[PDB]
Design a protein around this ligand. Structure first.
Ligand SMILES: CCCCCCCCCCCCCCCC(=O)O
Ligand SMILES: CCCCCCCCCCCCCCCC(=O)O
Ligand SMILES: *C(=O)CCCCCCCCCCCCCCC
Lengths: 42, 49
């Protein structure tokens, strides 16, 4: 019959999304650690 | 006995139990996605923002 989508059938796109958000925060923090350390020298 | 001309047409038929089917309500445009996907979309929307 005509079945409705379940979270199992789409959870894959949910793991990439959360992975992207974690990666984006990591990228932002790394640029923060670089500028913060550089500012101390200057 | 001696019957009379058919005053009504019958015929064997197979009765069963009626497989009741849900009746789409007003909020039936949400049927394609299970409510657990809609719940997670809201959480994803909050998390992404
Ligand atoms: C842009 C960043 C993307 C990050 C994507 C992370 C996804 C991780 C999902 C792991 C699921 C478990 C392993 C399954 C592997 C497989 O089935 O081949
Ligand atoms: C999975 C959870 C991870 C939690 C990460 C906590 C740390 C986030 C960054 C805090 C500031 C780090 C940089 C401080 C200044 C510096 O040393 O350059
Ligand atoms: C400067 O270099 C700071 C480095 C900080 C590293 C830690 C940042 C982690 C950010 C990603 C967290 C993702 C969590 C996902 C759920 C567990």
């Amino acid at each position: 019959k005509t079945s409705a989508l379940s979270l199992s059938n789409v959870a894959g796109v949910f793991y990439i999304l959360v992975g992207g958000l974690g990666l984006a925060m990591l990228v932002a923090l790394i640029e923060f650690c670089y500028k913060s350390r550089a500012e101390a020298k200057r | 006995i001696d019957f009379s001309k058919p005053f009504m047409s019958l015929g064997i038929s197979i009765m069963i139990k009626k497989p009741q089917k849900s009746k789409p309500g007003v909020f039936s445009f949400l049927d394609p996605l299970a409510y657990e996907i809609w719940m997670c979309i809201v959480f994803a929307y909050i998390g992404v923002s």
